[PDB]
Design a protein around this ligand. Sequence first.
Ligand SMILES: COc1nccnc1C(C)C
Ligand code: NA
Ligand code: NA
Ligand code: NA
Length: 157
Amino acid sequence: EEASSTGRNFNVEKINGEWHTIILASDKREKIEDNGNFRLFLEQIHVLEKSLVLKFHTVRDEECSELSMVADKTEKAGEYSVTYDGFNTFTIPKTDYDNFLMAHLINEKDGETFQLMGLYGREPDLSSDIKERFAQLCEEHGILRENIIDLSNANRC
Ligand SMILES: COc1nccnc1C(C)C
Ligand code: NA
Ligand code: NA
Ligand code: NA
């Protein structure tokens, strides 16, 4: 069974736990390239009453650094906000809880904005069919495949 965070049948507790960044995408590709601030490797999501504690690691010169961030629920169901290199809001348009999680984020910094989409897996990689489903969701948001970066060959420290 699949659900969206914005949907009536969403069960937020079910996204608690281990996750790995499999693919990232953006309509501002530099944000997720090598030294981009949004090239984040998710490790776990801790579900709380009104927030999600996101644990990531970033990479610089082949060196991993831990980074934790707290996302608060906003006034719209299924939407979360978090301060990180600007003001961010995100939703989970599709997840099956047991294999994948697809997030759609809007960042706003210095009066600008960009979209980020992420595909996270319970294991360090996902099937090619789920990766294709993610590409389809990115296309629905006007993000070209050339702006989608598979990081499955580089998500471990
Ligand atoms: C700040 O939020 C993020 N940044 C980069 C990748 N993924 C995320 C969360 C949406 C999980
Ligand atoms: Na809104
Ligand atoms: Na959407
Ligand atoms: Na959205």
